[PDB]
Amino acid sequence: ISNYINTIPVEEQPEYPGNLELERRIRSAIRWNAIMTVLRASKKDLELGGHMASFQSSATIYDVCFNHFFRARNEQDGGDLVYFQGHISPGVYARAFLEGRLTQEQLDNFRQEVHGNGLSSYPHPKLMPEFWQFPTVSMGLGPIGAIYQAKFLKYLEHRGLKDTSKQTVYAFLGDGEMDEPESKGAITIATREKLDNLVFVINCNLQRLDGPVTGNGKIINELEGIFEGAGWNVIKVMWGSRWDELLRKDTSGKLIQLMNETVDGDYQTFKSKDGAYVREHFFGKYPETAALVADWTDEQIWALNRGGHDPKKIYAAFKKAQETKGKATVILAHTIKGYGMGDAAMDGVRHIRDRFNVPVSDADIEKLPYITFPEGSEEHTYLHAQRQKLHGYLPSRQPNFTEKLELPSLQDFGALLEEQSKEISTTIAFVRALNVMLKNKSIKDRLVPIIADEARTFGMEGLFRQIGIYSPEDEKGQILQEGINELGAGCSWLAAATSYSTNNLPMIPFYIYYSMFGFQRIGDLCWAAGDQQARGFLIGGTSGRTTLNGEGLQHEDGHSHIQSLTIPNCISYDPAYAYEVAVIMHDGLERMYGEKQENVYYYITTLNENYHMPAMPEGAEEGIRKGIYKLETIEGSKGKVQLLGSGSILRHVREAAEILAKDYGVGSDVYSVTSFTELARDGQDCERWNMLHPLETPRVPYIAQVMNDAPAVASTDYMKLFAEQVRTYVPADDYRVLGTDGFGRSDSRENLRHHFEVDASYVVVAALGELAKRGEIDKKVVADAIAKFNIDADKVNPRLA
Amino acid sequence: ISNYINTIPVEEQPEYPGNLELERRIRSAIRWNAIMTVLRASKKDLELGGHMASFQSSATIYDVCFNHFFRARNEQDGGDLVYFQGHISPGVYARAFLEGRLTQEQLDNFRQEVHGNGLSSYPHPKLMPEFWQFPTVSMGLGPIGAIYQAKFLKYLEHRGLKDTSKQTVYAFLGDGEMDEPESKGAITIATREKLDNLVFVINCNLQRLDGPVTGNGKIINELEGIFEGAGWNVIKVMWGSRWDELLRKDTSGKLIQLMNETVDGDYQTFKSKDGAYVREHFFGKYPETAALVADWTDEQIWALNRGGHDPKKIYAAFKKAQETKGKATVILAHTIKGYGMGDAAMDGVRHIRDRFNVPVSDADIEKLPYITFPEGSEEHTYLHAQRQKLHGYLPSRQPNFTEKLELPSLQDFGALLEEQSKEISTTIAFVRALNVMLKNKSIKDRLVPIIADEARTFGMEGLFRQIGIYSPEDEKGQILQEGINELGAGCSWLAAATSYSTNNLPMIPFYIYYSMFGFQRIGDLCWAAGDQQARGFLIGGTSGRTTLNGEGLQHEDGHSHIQSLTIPNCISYDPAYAYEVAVIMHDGLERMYGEKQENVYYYITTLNENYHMPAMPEGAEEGIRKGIYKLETIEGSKGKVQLLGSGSILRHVREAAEILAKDYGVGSDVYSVTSFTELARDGQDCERWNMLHPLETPRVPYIAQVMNDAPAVASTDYMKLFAEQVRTYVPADDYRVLGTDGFGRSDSRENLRHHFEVDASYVVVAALGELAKRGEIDKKVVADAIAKFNIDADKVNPRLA
Ligand SMILES: Cc1ncc(C[n+]2csc(CCOP(=O)(O)OP(=O)(O)O)c2C)c(N)n1
Ligand SMILES: Cc1ncc(C[n+]2csc(CCOP(=O)(O)OP(=O)(O)O)c2C)c(N)n1
Ligand SMILES: [Mg+2]
Ligand SMILES: [Mg+2]
């Protein structure tokens, strides 16, 4: 930690290149318009919300960047990737409006988007696909997402895919937000990878929402200490130009001492006082300091500003940042929250009008008018001249990539569609499908396999010799190894999954990890990924409650699919066979990176258990993609049931079908459900359409088109709700669902499958139970089966176990 | 960062207090038993799993701690809180067995616990309620958890609730694990809070699973750099005692330079070599360094040890940490991962027994026998004598607290059961309920309100003046303000929620935050909380997709209940009325902290929307707890339906009921469902039991004892699945569910409820559609309703919007 003063002394401060007066004129108009759209929205009294205080404290920081640093998307690259602080959006809208990119009607529709011509509260690409790029409102996600975006840009350059050398990634953060563990939890990575293309801009106004970050301390010093410790280049923008003279005359070094010794809370109090309270309480601390302002008017004292409000001090920091190589830079900008709002945190509106000399007359002020700059005006000319010199306007977004890829056909996955000689798993099938893709000329180098330390666990070691590990094992290595960092890996996956839009360069990521450490551990990023229109593959390996058998409670995943189904644009599958994995992966590739360019990402749970992999039934392709298909029918004269299974449990329901036929003469229709979720969604869509079209013939859910009315039983390696979600659409009178509800524990797969009551014997008992209720068989028949199969009818519900 | 040598010079370390020779015999027997345990498990060929290499590298560190530092639970406090590294559990089980706390059968049942007398793979209190205490296998969670546990202990002392001054929180971490953002993301608060009762002990063997953490770097230096920068006291345990002579006589300072410049990758290669290699490649780098070992034999050079394996160096570090005040201490212990195994890292184990001189011939080595110390033996006596001096054995856990609390009665919440004067929200109801508890002499001071910055948003700012904010706003403040740090707030919540077991001092936490940032953002911690048997309240404020209307996509929560239902021991509720909030909170209090001491925690979603709060219907209490009750029946001669709602949407379902009655002559039964999830679980439990007892009287789902068979419609502020989960148990032919599937966006509550097709008009159309389907009404009526209510039947599915 250094002295509590600017990192760059005036003598080392470059000359400011812009017209300060004209820029203030433009900046004031932007400030006014941002305040007007929020105030107009609030006038509606519809609890719309929207912030002003924050943007007021950081407007000049952004202004300097828009005028002299921010490079817009161009023919060569996607420009600078700016992670705009979420709640300062009204300022971004205000500027875009001034630039003529947004209309007054859209501003008047701030936070009212349902009808089409509105603006989102925050940066939401899904909602404004041609405007916003990075979802930053969920604090903490922006800093880490930006770190890996910067790393990914280096990756593209190192892999020879794209020269991203002219791009800088800017993460605009708040000091309070740095408390989120993901904000500083990964900063050493930027040092390890020498991310000199990443700039953290922390708005240090010393306050969070309900108070100061650390009133009894100095967060700017805490921030400097840890970022410096993490190897980052730290630039503190503490004081404005007015202080330069005071510090130079400060021969006793007492001013610096006073500055150093004052804590955040104190500084914050002076904030609400006056030029005399300051001189008395701040400067008045030491005669050496009090004597410095002795010859100063209380107004000249109160005129001393924080560095984050001085274009000159701001420019110096961003310039130094862009010059620095070898490591990332963090700019700690000292600002005043709710700057120039005084009374705030029509008299107040008149105050800011006067305060920033806004060109609005007394006659119009009540109309809460938006200000614009006429073509031909100095402000209009300058505003656009600065942007054009920087490649245009930002933020802006391109929803689809331009190139045409020559994707592998399903037949290219032919070997995976055949019966397998060796017993393998769906994970081995996944890796195999990856290899098929690695042979496709068009996308082979666009593939981005991602691992979080463990590769051997997922049988990925074989890929290393083929494509290598990115290690700028060299800068040309293709696989991203992020170590024990699921969030960081997800952020690399996200950068890769959105490269098609950001850099107009489609990249296809495949991140495989322990399924339990997916949505459960990085769920907020997964939701943000949906917002960012990520197109990629998330592979939840070692999935299923009873399949990762020895690991126990914090590893056994019987619910990730319940978490994944909450994301609208995530397509989830739980295949049982290798050929299903092939079909599913081929379809995803086609949908996401083929002509369709569907904004959806995939989640496929794969297993670590080997078993016989049969050949794909001819014509099963569509059913596999839709989520279900009849595997086969077993004859039985004494009854008929329908059996459903997915993942590693399907082969157990298949065994139950043979037992049912063999021991009870009960035949059955056996279905492989590759996706209970896609089926549920299809069912919901049909029922929704039916309800909205009362005069039309009811549409039939696909699952109802595939199944019949015979009593049905479903068993899965996930909690019952996974299969129970399609009940409404199952055309059978009876539908019994078996599942792995309850906490996992360590055992053999056999003991776990019996414990969670999802094995063959339970499926059989469940099937017999429905047939008995129908009078097709006697109840003593099921009571005997229960005894026969060594089933404890009275053991505690596994959910409670 | 400092030189790559021990922090404590030999001339500064204290005399080792223990019997080194006796201690190594005991340590060797533990190492043996740990390996035997894992080897016998693998022999079973059941894919059970289990690690050995990690505990081998940290064995000596734990040994010194067990012999001279770890305080077991005692009459005065819970002893030292040790977050044992998850995968080194076999070593903990090995010592426990040697202490006579575990049986051979139990060791023989390592990772086979489904039938009882077995051992969990990792620290899981839910599975081993009297042994383990803190779930640490999900890496990254142990470190944040520990920081907040230490802070909570300080809190108990400062609040005058318990003298926790004699307790130390030890977090045993892996160096690879430090890559998880949660690992270092919150270390600055240990400095902010001067947590000198916290010790992070990182095993620095330089390797994660599949490779070194930073092959071309120095993680120990990286670690030292950021922790030192964060204000922590860093103690490096680099080299064993054999290095002291070499470092002492090296007047040139070249050995340190060599040590400093050598990277992690090279140090690791040396480990796979021999003395000759080291002499040439390491010492041979410089003449001065070559000269230090020139008079040494290759064997003597090969014997040079890493500090973390030297009891004297280890002891010095822990003793010094014990003396450090004002801040937390990190011990960076340098170790060898595949430490004795060497070649490994049933007879090849004779190499391990040889090197550690284990008493067992190669004749009984294939039998993999366990080693025990007979009562009276020098080893047995020393083992127990050391533990007795430290108050006993650990880990150990007490499942229930001993004291009896005088909980508030439901009557105490009587004001909340009456009709409210003004329109309030369920969040205002929650705060009012908290106030009732705050008047209870028994639990008022055991309450732990927790917020993450935002308090005003949740109307919590009023308790700020009565009970204060913890700020060691003073050291007696009751409210924990954790800033913008949901994970941290969650860890404080967990520490509080488990104080009943850890310190035999029940504390009742109430953590309120934006519901979207609950399970979605800290879901892995929530799962671990269940594992840790947390008893507390999670309050998801500003919940419901359409109710936090202006916030949009990353804030509008219509799925947290779908995430919360995946946790076995989390009880979820979505109340609509203030009296329901009261009944639920009181019941939760009684269940968790009353004589029942139920191991469950609560999740209640509350709202920021004000509306009329009616009085509780007489006798509705049990129904509120169970999940559903009939609000009222509206008469109608033209038809009859059932209408269900929860949270903010219930009042719109009631409006629909009036419309149907008044405009269409359709009568109805209106139900408020406080918990669709609890109703679903009850139904699942009933059918499970039923099918398991086929000849017995069938149990009827609670929801089927409330609803009848008229066509039903349900609507809530959550995705359809939240209400559809009870389908199987609804005693009706038609059960139409409306929901908020799809990403959120900004608009008025009205516009959002129409967009998400969940408002009164949609409920009416859904109900009429069901009747038309039964011919009880013309389809034209439904079509005209759709027209009247301005419903766009061809609007895109909200899930896809
Ligand atoms: C994960 C998450 N938690 C909470 C919030 C709610 N929130 C909005 S603004 C705010 C405080 C902002 O403080 P800071 O990050 O210091 O930025 P400032 O507005 O002062 O520039 C909070 C907590 C959020 N957006 N995301
Ligand atoms: C969140 C999480 N991700 C992955 C794993 C799987 N895992 C088990 S051991 C291991 C590596 C451990 O390395 P380190 O933390 O350096 O400890 P060491 O075993 O070397 O002492 C990993 C990634 C886990 N337990 N938790
Ligand atoms: Mg701030
Ligand atoms: Mg390690």
For A173, the 3-state DSSP assignment is strand
- In the sheet that B329-334 helps form, which strands lie side by side, from edge to edge? B81-83, B169-174, B198-204, B329-334, B233-237
Of B256, B321, B240, give the one whose Cα is nearest residue B288.
B256
Chain A residues touching residue B550 (CB < 8 angstroms): 46-50, 111, 121
CA distances from B796 to B118, B486, B722, B801 (A): 54, 35, 21, 6
Name the minimum distance, in Å, from the CA of A797 to any CA of chain B: 7
Partner residue opposite A484 with nearest CB, options B188, B208, B750: B208
Q: B-contacting residues of A 130-149, CB under 8 Å?
A: 135, 137-140, 144
Q: B-contacting residues of A 432-461, CB under 8 Å?
A: 453-456
- Outline where A389-470 has alpha helix (H): 414-417, 426-437, 461-467
Output the CA torsion sign for A747, A748, A751, A753. Answer: positive
DSSP state at residue A307: G
Number of Cβ atoms within 10 Å of the Cβ of B405? 18
Report the C-alpha gap between A454 and A427 in whole angstroms: 14
Which two tokens mark B725? 């989960």
The answer regarding whether domain B621-801 maps to CATH 3.40.50.2000 reads no
Q: For ligand 2, atom 10, which residue shows the shortest CA distance?
A: B209
Chain B residues touching residue A487 (CB < 8 angstroms): 180-181
> Is any ligand 2 atom within 6 A of the Cβ of residue B139?
yes
- Please check whether residue B250 touches A, CB under 8 A: no
For A515, the 3-state DSSP assignment is helix
Report the C-alpha gap between A296 and B220 in whole angstroms: 52
Which two tokens mark A53? 């205080």
The answer to whether the CB of B431 falls within 8 A of the CB of B606 is: no
For A615, the 3-state DSSP assignment is coil
Report the C-alpha gap between B739 and B728 in whole angstroms: 18
Side chain identity, residue A785 = A
Atom of ligand 1 nearest to the CA of A141: 1
B652-658 contacts: CB < 8 A, separation 24 or more? B652/B715, B652/B753, B652/B758, B652/B759, B652/B760, B652/B763, B653/B713, B653/B714, B653/B715, B653/B760, B653/B763, B655/B760, B656/B713, B656/B715, B656/B760, B656/B761, B656/B763, B656/B764, B656/B767, B658/B634
- Outline where B665-793 has alpha helix (H): 676-692, 721-724, 749-755, 760-773, 779-788
Cβ-Cβ contacts under 8 Å for A295 (sequence gap 6 or more):
none
Does the distance separating the beta carbons of A794 and B120 come in below 8 Å?
no
Of B199, B137, B132, give the one whose Cα is nearest residue B171.
B199
The answer to whether the CB of A90 falls within 8 A of the CB of A34 is: yes
Q: What angle do CA A108, A109, A111 make, to 5 degrees?
A: 125
> Is any ligand 2 atom within 6 A of the Cβ of residue A553?
no
Atom of ligand 2 nearest to the CA of A457: 6
- The residues pairing with A177 across neighbouring beta strands, listed in sequence order, are none
Output the CA torsion sign for A640, A641, A646, A650. Answer: negative
C-alpha A489: how far from its chain's center? 12
Report the C-alpha gap between A723 and A738 in whole angstroms: 8
DSSP state at residue B703: G
- The residues pairing with A83 across neighbouring beta strands, listed in sequence order, are A171
> Which burial class, exposed, middle or buried, applies to B497 when counting CB atoms under 10 A from its CB (0-12, 13-18, 19+)?
buried
Of A81, A96, A120, A121, give the one whose Cα is nearest residue A33.
A96
Report the C-alpha gap between A476 and B249 in whole angstroms: 45
The answer to whether the CB of A204 falls within 8 A of the CB of A335 is: yes
Side chain identity, residue A209 = L
- Outline where B230-286 has alpha helix (H): 242-249, 254-261, 264-271, 275-281
Q: What is the helix (H) or strand (E) element at residue B487, kind and residue range?
A: helix B486-497
Report the C-alpha gap between A513 and A490 in whole angstroms: 10
Chain B residues touching residue A216 (CB < 8 angstroms): 471
Which two tokens mark A323? 């010059």
The answer to whether the CB of B754 falls within 8 A of the CB of B740 is: no
Of A439, A437, A434, A426, give the one whose Cα is nearest residue A451.
A434
C-alpha A92: how far from its chain's center? 21
CA distances from A543 to A433, A514, A546 (A): 18, 7, 9
The answer to whether the CB of A281 falls within 8 A of the CB of A271 is: no
Of A569, A598, A443, A437, give the one whose Cα is nearest residue A506.
A443
Among chain B residues, CA nearest to A685: B797
The answer to whether the CB of B334 falls within 8 A of the CB of B267 is: no
Query: To one decimal place, what's the resolution in Å?
Result: 1.9
The region, left, alpha or beta by phi > 0 then psi within -120 to 50, assigned to residue B627 is left
Chain B residues touching residue A748 (CB < 8 angstroms): 44, 46-48, 112
- Outline where B110-241 has alpha helix (H): 141-158, 181-184, 188-192, 219-229
Which two tokens mark A316? 């110096």
Report the C-alpha gap between A174 and B283 in whole angstroms: 49
Q: What are the DSSP E strand ranges found in A178-273?
A: 198-204, 207-208, 211-212, 233-237
Residue intervals in chain B for CATH 3.40.50.970:
1-402, 403-620
Report the C-alpha gap between B664 and B647 in whole angstroms: 26
Q: What are phi and psi of A392, to 5 degrees?
A: 120, -145
| DSSP string computed for A45-67 | -S------HHHHHHHHHHHHHHH
Report the C-alpha gap between B525 and A57 in whole angstroms: 35
For B629, the 3-state DSSP assignment is strand
How long, in residues, is chain A?
801
How do beta strands A198-204 and A169-174 pair? parallel
Chain A residues touching residue B746 (CB < 8 angstroms): 48, 111-113, 118-121
Residue intervals in chain B for CATH 3.40.50.920:
621-801
For B171, the 3-state DSSP assignment is strand
Q: What are phi and psi of A373, to 5 degrees?
A: -110, 120
For B431, the 3-state DSSP assignment is helix
The answer to whether the CB of B308 falls within 8 A of the CB of B57 is: yes
The answer to whether the CB of B613 falls within 8 A of the CB of B429 is: yes
Q: What is the helix (H) or strand (E) element at residue B463, kind and residue range?
A: helix B463-466
> Is any ligand 2 atom within 6 A of the Cβ of residue B56?
no
Instruction: Tell whether omega for the bond before A129 is within 30 degrees of 0, i.e. cis.
Output: no
Q: What are phi and psi of B717, to 5 degrees?
A: -85, 15
Of A563, A488, A529, A514, give the one whose Cα is nearest residue A182.
A488
Among chain B residues, CA nearest to A178: B484
Instruction: Tell whether omega for the bond before B509 is within 30 degrees of 0, i.e. cis.
Output: no
Report the C-alpha gap between A283 and A294 in whole angstroms: 9
Q: Which CATH architecture has domain B1-402?
A: 3-Layer(aba) Sandwich (3.40)
Report the C-alpha gap between A69 and A65 in whole angstroms: 5
Q: What is the helix (H) or strand (E) element at residue A317, kind and residue range?
A: helix A311-323
Report the C-alpha gap between A57 and B390 in whole angstroms: 55
**C-alpha dihedral over A232, A238, A243, A246, to 10 degrees?**
-70
- Please check whether residue B743 touches A, CB under 8 A: yes
- Please check whether residue A40 touches B, CB under 8 A: no
Of B670, B619, B673, B668, give the one whose Cα is nearest residue B647.
B673
Q: What are phi and psi of A578, to 5 degrees?
A: -60, -40
Does the distance separating the beta carbons of A455 and B210 come in below 8 Å?
yes
Gyration radius of chain B over CA positions: 31
- The residues pairing with B738 across neighbouring beta strands, listed in sequence order, are B715
Number of Cβ atoms within 10 Å of the Cβ of A117? 11
For chain B, breaks with the C atom over 2.5 A from the next N come after 345, 472
Among chain A residues, CA nearest to B519: A520
Atom of ligand 1 nearest to the CA of A86: 25
Q: A-contacting residues of B 152-211, CB under 8 Å?
A: 174, 176-177, 179-189, 191-192, 208-211
| DSSP string computed for B102-129 | S-HHHHHTBT--TTSS-B-SS--TTTST
How long, in residues, is chain B?
801
Among chain A residues, CA nearest to B181: A185
| DSSP string computed for A107-157 | HTTBT--TTSS-B-SS--TTTSTTT------STTHHHHHHHHHHHHHHHHH
CA distances from B203 to A453, B64, B70, B157 (A): 17, 14, 17, 30
Experimentally determined by: X-ray
Report the C-alpha gap between B793 and B796 in whole angstroms: 9
Does the distance separating the beta carbons of A751 and B115 come in below 8 Å?
yes
According to CATH, the superfamily of the domain at A403-620 is Thiamin diphosphate (ThDP)-binding fold, Pyr/PP domains (3.40.50.970)
Report the C-alpha gap between A136 and A395 in whole angstroms: 13
Q: What are phi and psi of B672, to 5 degrees?
A: -105, 120
Of A179, A533, A520, A602, give the one whose Cα is nearest residue B520.
A520
Q: What angle do CA B559, B564, B568 make, to 5 degrees?
A: 150
The answer to whether the CB of A714 falls within 8 A of the CB of A723 is: yes
Q: What are phi and psi of A755, to 5 degrees?
A: -55, -50
Q: What are phi and psi of A423, to 5 degrees?
A: -80, 130
- Please check whether residue A632 touches B, CB under 8 A: no
Report the C-alpha gap between B375 and B268 in whole angstroms: 42
The terminus-to-terminus CA distance of chain A in angstroms comes to 53
Ligand 4 centroid to Cα of residue B127, in Å, is 27
B205 marked among binding-site residues: yes
Does the distance separating the beta carbons of B521 and A523 come in below 8 Å?
yes
Would you report the helix, strand and coil content of chain A in percent, each value rounded to 5?
45, 10, 45
- Please check whether residue A74 touches B, CB under 8 A: no
Of B517, B559, B518, give the one whose Cα is nearest residue B744.
B559
Which two tokens mark A216? 């009894």
The region, left, alpha or beta by phi > 0 then psi within -120 to 50, assigned to residue A685 is alpha
